[PDB]
């Protein structure tokens, strides 16, 4: 509780500095625009990777380049029902990745979800609205998972009492 707001403030301060993008054409293959964090051909166009950790489980990894940025999020998972609901919810969002425009189809290993943002998205939208969407997404996931868990338990009690009444 006390660690939540400094964690989100540090993540917001780190994402503001890494979202300064620019249009750039490929110097290896002629007439190509590629995201430089994925191809990794030229080593002078990459920045240092950074991470922010709240505890031993929750962390955020940020990797940058001249025209692209990649954000990987690890989500708090307490027990078995929470991690299977988290796995179902992340699979449900990553199937519909063509409607979001900033989502990867598969996450980076060791993490749960990844965002890939290029310079066309920050040409089409504002920067601070994208930062606000990332912070709002990270806030809403845990409340959603807790409400789903409480709904499952409140359903199961009524089903058990309805079966044992008529016997």
């Amino acid at each position: 509780t006390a660690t939540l707001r400094p964690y989100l403030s540090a993540v917001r301060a780190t994402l503001q500095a890494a979202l300064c993008l620019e249009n750039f054409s490929s110097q290896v293959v002629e007439r190509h625009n590629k995201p430089e964090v994925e191809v990794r051909s030229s080593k002078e166009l990459l920045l240092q990777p950074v991470t922010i950790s709240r505890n031993e489980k929750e962390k955020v990894l940020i990797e940058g380049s001249i025209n692209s940025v990649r954000v990987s999020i690890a989500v708090k998972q307490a027990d078995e029902i929470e991690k299977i609901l988290c796995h179902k919810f992340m699979r449900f969002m990553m199937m519909r990745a063509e409607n979001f425009f900033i989502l990867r189809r598969k996450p980076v290993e060791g993490y749960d979800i990844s965002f890939l943002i290029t310079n066309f998205h920050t040409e089409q939208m504002y920067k601070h609205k994208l930062v606000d969407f990332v912070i709002h997404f990270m806030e809403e996931i845990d409340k959603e998972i807790s409400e789903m868990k409480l709904s499952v338990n409140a359903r199961a009690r009524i089903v058990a009492e309805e079966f044992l009444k008529n016997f």
Binding site: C20, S25, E30, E123
Partner: protein, 370 residues
């Protein structure tokens, strides 16, 4: 602080004519639109469609009225006006990568194109057979050239690139130019000679913008690690560097002998001072926040509102600066580098802004530009 919203999609680059009555700009596609001021409104006057790729550079000569364009299709065109119709002419560049930047010479007899094939192309006009020929500067460039500037004696050139260095080259062509004189930068000027190389050791930032002064003996450049640097050639070529506390800057311009105006990802122009002793200091932001943002929404009340945001933090729906996105180009609008009174800025949000020095002197307390 005059804002005009042209269009919603971003503006890549812009150019003015001699009398500052017409403007030419690219609407993030393969066409060039020329707008003319009629009465008190801007109307579209001409459209130029020849390229097959993204337009990366437009320049307009003040005397001869010719427009050079370069794009990402490895091509360059020179446009001239005949009977109210603009006609193009192809320039052979002999490059295998995309082109990034184009600048005219001060005497309008050659032009320089910086491209991504680790070279700089200098193009002039051959009139015996009537086409534009080119020459190449290659060594020791190792990456993509991002910016260019011309010395006022029509010989020297300055370049910045992605190998964290800023270089000064000599571009002297015997068929067009005459014999130059001596400079504090150097004394021996063949073609392609490296005069000076600058850059930090171990601290890597991409150089986005370079600029010369009015007299031509001082150089300034900006980088990606939030640093502004000024090199002086007369005092045995010293370099002064200032580390700012803001987002990186993408443009730079000398407005006098001792004043630097810059802009970038913080959406507002800022002013820097350079004295004769060699100290680079930060003076002020030139976009003072509107009409105080109405005493900054009542100074005591926004301090209590920051206590209210310490309770419930919510985000600002519209930024208080006159540009809602980044600024990519700063240009001088009134007279020249010797006497500057107004300047123009363009940006990603699709707006054009004209600023005046006298109104900013009158509004901002204790502000004095020289």
């Amino acid at each position: 602080m005059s804002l005009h919203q042209f269009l919603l999609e971003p503006i890549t680059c812009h150019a003015w004519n001699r009398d500052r009555t017409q403007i030419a700009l690219s609407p993030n596609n393969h066409e060039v639109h020329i707008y003319k001021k009629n009465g008190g409104q801007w109307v579209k006057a001409h459209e130029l469609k020849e390229h097959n790729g993204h337009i990366t550079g437009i320049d307009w000569a003040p005397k001869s009225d010719r427009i050079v364009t370069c794009g990402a299709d490895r091509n360059a065109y020179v446009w001239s006006q005949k009977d109210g119709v603009w006609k193009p002419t192809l320039v052979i560049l002999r490059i295998n990568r995309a082109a990034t930047f184009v600048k005219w010479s001060p005497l309008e007899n050659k032009f320089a194109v910086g491209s991504g094939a680790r070279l700089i192309s200098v193009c002039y006009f051959e009139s015996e057979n009537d086409w534009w020929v080119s020459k190449h500067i290659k060594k020791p460039i190792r990456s993509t050239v991002l910016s260019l500037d011309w010395h006022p004696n029509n010989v020297l050139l300055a370049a910045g690139s992605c190998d964290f260095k800023c270089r000064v080259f000599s571009a002297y062509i015997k068929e067009v130019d005459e014999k130059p004189a001596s400079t504090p930068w150097g004394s021996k000027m063949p073609f392609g000679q490296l005069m000076s190389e600058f850059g930090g050791s171990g601290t890597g930032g991409w150089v986005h913008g370079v600029s010369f002064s009015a007299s031509g003996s001082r150089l300034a450049w900006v980088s990606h690690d939030s640093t502004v640097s000024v090199a002086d050639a007369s005092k045995s070529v010293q370099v002064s560097t200032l580390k700012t506390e803001f987002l990186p800057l993408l443009s730079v311009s000398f407005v006098s002998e001792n004043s630097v105006v810059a802009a970038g990802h913080d959406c507002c122009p800022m002013l820097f001072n350079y004295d004769d002793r060699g100290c680079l200091t930060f003076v002020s932001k030139l976009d003072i926040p509107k009409q105080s943002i109405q005493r900054n929404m009542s100074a005591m009340e926004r301090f209590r509102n920051m206590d209210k945001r310490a309770t419930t933090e919510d985000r600002n729906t519209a930024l208080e600066t006159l540009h809602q996105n980044s600024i990519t180009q700063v240009s001088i609008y009134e007279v020249d580098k010797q006497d500057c009174r107004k300047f123009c800025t363009t940006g990603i949000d699709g707006a054009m802004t004209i600023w005046d020095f006298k109104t900013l002197e009158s509004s901002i307390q204790g502000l004095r530009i020289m």
